[PDB]
Amino acid sequence: EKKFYELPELPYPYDALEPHISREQLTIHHQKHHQAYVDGANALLRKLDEARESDTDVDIKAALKELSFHVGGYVLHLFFWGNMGPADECGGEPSGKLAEYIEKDFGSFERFRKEFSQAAISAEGSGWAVLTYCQRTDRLFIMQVEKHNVNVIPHFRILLVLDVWEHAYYIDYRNVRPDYVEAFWNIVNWKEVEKRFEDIL
Amino acid sequence: EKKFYELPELPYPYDALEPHISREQLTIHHQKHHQAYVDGANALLRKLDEARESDTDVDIKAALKELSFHVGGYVLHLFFWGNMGPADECGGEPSGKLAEYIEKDFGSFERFRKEFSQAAISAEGSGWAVLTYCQRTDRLFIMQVEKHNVNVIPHFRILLVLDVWEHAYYIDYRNVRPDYVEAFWNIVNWKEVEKRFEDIL
Amino acid sequence: EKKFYELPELPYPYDALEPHISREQLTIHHQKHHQAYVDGANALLRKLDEARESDTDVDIKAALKELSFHVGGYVLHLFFWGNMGPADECGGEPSGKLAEYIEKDFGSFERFRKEFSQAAISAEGSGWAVLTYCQRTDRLFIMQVEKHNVNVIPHFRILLVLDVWEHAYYIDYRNVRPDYVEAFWNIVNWKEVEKRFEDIL
Amino acid sequence: EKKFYELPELPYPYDALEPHISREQLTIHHQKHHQAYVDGANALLRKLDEARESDTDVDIKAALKELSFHVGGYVLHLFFWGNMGPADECGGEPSGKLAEYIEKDFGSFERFRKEFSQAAISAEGSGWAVLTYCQRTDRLFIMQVEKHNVNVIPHFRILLVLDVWEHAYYIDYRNVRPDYVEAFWNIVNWKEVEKRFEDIL
Ligand SMILES: [Fe+3]
Ligand SMILES: [Fe+3]
Numbered sequence: 001e002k003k004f005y006e007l008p009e010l011p012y013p014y015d016a017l018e019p020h021i022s023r024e025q026l027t028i029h030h031q032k033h034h035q036a037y038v039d040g041a042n043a044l045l046r047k048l049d050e051a052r053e054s055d056t057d058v059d060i061k062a063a064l065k066e067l068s069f070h071v072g073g074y075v076l077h078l079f080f081w082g083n084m085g086p087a088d089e090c091g092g093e094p095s096g097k098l099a100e101y102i103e104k105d106f107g108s109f110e111r112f113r114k115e116f117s118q119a120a121i122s123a124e125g126s127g128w129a130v131l132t133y134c135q136r137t138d139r140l141f142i143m144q145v146e147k148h149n150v151n152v153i154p155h156f157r158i159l160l161v162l163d164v165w166e167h168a169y170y171i172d173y174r175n176v177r178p179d180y181v182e183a184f185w186n187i188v189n190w191k192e193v194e195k196r197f198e199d200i201l
Numbered sequence: 202e203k204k205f206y207e208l209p210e211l212p213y214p215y216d217a218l219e220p221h222i223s224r225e226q227l228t229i230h231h232q233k234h235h236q237a238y239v240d241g242a243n244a245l246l247r248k249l250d251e252a253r254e255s256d257t258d259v260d261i262k263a264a265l266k267e268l269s270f271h272v273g274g275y276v277l278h279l280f281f282w283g284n285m286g287p288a289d290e291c292g293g294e295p296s297g298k299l300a301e302y303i304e305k306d307f308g309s310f311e312r313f314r315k316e317f318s319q320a321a322i323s324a325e326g327s328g329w330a331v332l333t334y335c336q337r338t339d340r341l342f343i344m345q346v347e348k349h350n351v352n353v354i355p356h357f358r359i360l361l362v363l364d365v366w367e368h369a370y371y372i373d374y375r376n377v378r379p380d381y382v383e384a385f386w387n388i389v390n391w392k393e394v395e396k397r398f399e400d401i402l
Numbered sequence: 403e404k405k406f407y408e409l410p411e412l413p414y415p416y417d418a419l420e421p422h423i424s425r426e427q428l429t430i431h432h433q434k435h436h437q438a439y440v441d442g443a444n445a446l447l448r449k450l451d452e453a454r455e456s457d458t459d460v461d462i463k464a465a466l467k468e469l470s471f472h473v474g475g476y477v478l479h480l481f482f483w484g485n486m487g488p489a490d491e492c493g494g495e496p497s498g499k500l501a502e503y504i505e506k507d508f509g510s511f512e513r514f515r516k517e518f519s520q521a522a523i524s525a526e527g528s529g530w531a532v533l534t535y536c537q538r539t540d541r542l543f544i545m546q547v548e549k550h551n552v553n554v555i556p557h558f559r560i561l562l563v564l565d566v567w568e569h570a571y572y573i574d575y576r577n578v579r580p581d582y583v584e585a586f587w588n589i590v591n592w593k594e595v596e597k598r599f600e601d602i603l
Numbered sequence: 604e605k606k607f608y609e610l611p612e613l614p615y616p617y618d619a620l621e622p623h624i625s626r627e628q629l630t631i632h633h634q635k636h637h638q639a640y641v642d643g644a645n646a647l648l649r650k651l652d653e654a655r656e657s658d659t660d661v662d663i664k665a666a667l668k669e670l671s672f673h674v675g676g677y678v679l680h681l682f683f684w685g686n687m688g689p690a691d692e693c694g695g696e697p698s699g700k701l702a703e704y705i706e707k708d709f710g711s712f713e714r715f716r717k718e719f720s721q722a723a724i725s726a727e728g729s730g731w732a733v734l735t736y737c738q739r740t741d742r743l744f745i746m747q748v749e750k751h752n753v754n755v756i757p758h759f760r761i762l763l764v765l766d767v768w769e770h771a772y773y774i775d776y777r778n779v780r781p782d783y784v785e786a787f788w789n790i791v792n793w794k795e796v797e798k799r800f801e802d803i804l
């Protein structure tokens with residue numbers, strides 16, 4: 001029998017990330033938008049299931065475009081919540097292998113922090129900055145994802161994620177995306193990113 | 202010291218896939234286009250390396266958009282070559298777990314074959330049909346990738362790939378993409394796809 | 403000598419559109435975001451001018467992609483302001499030829515209103531619903547623009563425009579884009595749209 | 604009663620553009636692909652008409668995305684045929700106002716030719732280089748359209764168009780898009796482009 005998406009609980013209370021992300025900001029991002037991608041993806045799964053059980057045609061171009069949108073939404077918000085936490089337990093900079101790779105690939109943490117920040121700030125409209133890793137060339141890559149599913153390298157795995165959809169910050173920072181991106185570095189959970197990085201060597 | 206992309210050898214001689222993909226068709230896809238993504242990705246890596254060594258600014262929005270394009274190109278062609286082979290060793294349909302999942306998720310191999318074929322045929326302009334798998338809901342998904350990097354679900358891994366860029370077939374089939382997609386099923390290497398599928402349970 | 407973009411004045415005071423769009427909502431959409439597209443487009447124009455004067459190379463792929471983004475932003479906000487006004491002077495439904503075309507192409511105003519509304523609501527992330535007209539087939543078309551420049555038919559002219567970027571409504575309606583879309587019909591300036599429609603027969 | 608798209612005749616015989624575009628190349632671009640956009644756009648028009656007559660729901664997101672694709676295809680191929688012709692009647696460079704604008708905006712015809720050529724060559728996958736004009740700033744712009752409908756500035760009108768979809772050249776030039784772009788300048792119909800430019804001042 002079939003299985004579906006559910007809204008994951010946050011790792012922490014809705015006010016865990018203040019003053020950097022407000023309780024109000026966090027609550028509605030999680031409960032309205034992230035939820036919308038859960039429901040989006042599920043509605044579509046049922047649609048495709050139905051067509052298969054009745055052996056009828058669907059517009060799969062439309063279906064798969066939409067599916068990639070919502071599941072991308074679901075997946076990115078999932079990692080996003082996971083690589084933040086309380087400021088007094090988080091922020092700072094990473095250590096261990098991740099630290100070493102950020103050095104060799106970017107020259108310094110500062111350089112990284114800055115490039116990753118430009119990737120977030122400069123995104124045209126809705127999107128994300130995402131850190132990932134090429135196995136093949138043994139290099140950390142940044143990608144700038146538009147929406148939840150545009151300009152992404154298939155098959156590459158997520159290390160660090162920063163939502164820069166307007167819904168993620170407009171309540172706390174209105175238009176001023178750079179202040180939000182700057183606040184973000186106070187609540188990055190490097191432990192989690194470090195862990196993620198280790199499971200792909 | 203730094204590391205770069207190289208054109209992978211084919212698993213087989215350039216005429217291994219006739220009459221379905223011609224020697225001419227295969228040779229230029231591999232040696233011109235796939236090569237172009239190698240060089241694209243490498244030029245860009247060097248560009249970013251240079252900016253880091255001289256600690257200067259780059260347009261990283263442009264850079265990362267381009268990077269995702271070429272590395273996507275590189276990665277998809279890599280899996281593409283790998284899940285084809287000689288018709289007399291390949292084609293048919295899969296077995297084992299992959300077979301079981303295709304049944305439960307699509308109802309039958311036929312249904313799958315057909316949906317995957319629509320995903321390839323109906324792609325607007327350059328792109329791919331790609332099979333993948335959601336861990337979370339335990340379901341095979343198809344995605345329809347435009348170019349090498351549009352409408353893809355970040356973090357999802359590649360099982361099966363079908364290039365449907367015009368360069369992949371125009372020599373052998375001109376405009377008639379459906380005949381090319383139909384020929385493809387004669388040379389799918391299910392062993393390889395089966396193996397890929399097992400390494401993500 | 404060269405010429406550049408400037409932020410157009412609104413046709414009306416920042417509180418002219420209350421209670422449907424608040425003075426706060428309108429002021430920052432206009433003065434922050436619309437402004438940002440002005441500056442984006444100008445920065446880029448100067449960049450291209452400089453390269454031409456020094457007869458040096460630019461990355462024109464990147465340049466033109468960005469240019470289409472900002473100028474699209476500029477152009478769409480320009481028509482957007484223009485086809486709204488005070489509720490007590492606007493809203494209602496159109497008359498004259500536009501009314502006749504909406505009937506013959508959509509069957510009724512209701513149908514139009516509803517389709518246009520789905521086009522706005524359902525847009526994935528940032529984008530617009532835009533009414534336009536095919537000369538060739540003599541039909542009103544709706545297009546759903548993502549960002550400012552995606553999924554638009556080149557050469558077709560703007561009649562009616564509804565911003566559905568989250569910055570357009572998040573202050574007044576937070577996540578609830580449908581309430582914003584619904585409010586919009588209270589402040590549509592049909593006179594303006596009617597006029598626009600007449601200048602392309 | 605309703606009206607639909609039809610495949611326009613070429614302004615000239617299928618061998619009119621040799622040796623630069625071959626009779627074979629031209630015939631299949633026109634009769635297969637351009638035709639496909641005609642049928643695509645018509646199928647969709649009927650779909651939307653049916654839903655309106657039966658007052659039923661459609662997926663208008665999907666519909667309008669697809670519509671913009673095919674009508675864009677239709678419109679761009681229409682202008683494309685129109686701004687080419689026989690080499691011995693065409694090519695060269697433009698004169699009159701267009702010539703003057705190309706000078707003041709690009710510095711020279713060479714610069715223009717070169718930038719326009721990069722816009723064509725560098726397009727990632729299927730797309731177009733298109734010349735157009737901003738009324739507001741009184742400047743010629745180039746845009747790089749992906750597919751038929753991506754990265755285009757809404758409302759701007761078409762002056763000059765170069766198809767760089769692989770189907771436009773793969774028969775004559777295989778992978779070597781630069782040779783095709785170079786050949787193109789031999790058959791540009793500047794009379795037509797000049798005329799187009801005059802009708803928007
Ligand atoms: Fe979000
Ligand atoms: Fe290819």
Ligand SMILES: [Fe+3]
Binds near residue numbers: 567
């Ligand atoms: Fe806006």
Ligand SMILES: [Fe+3]
Binds near residue numbers: 632636766768771
């Ligand atoms: Fe074409």
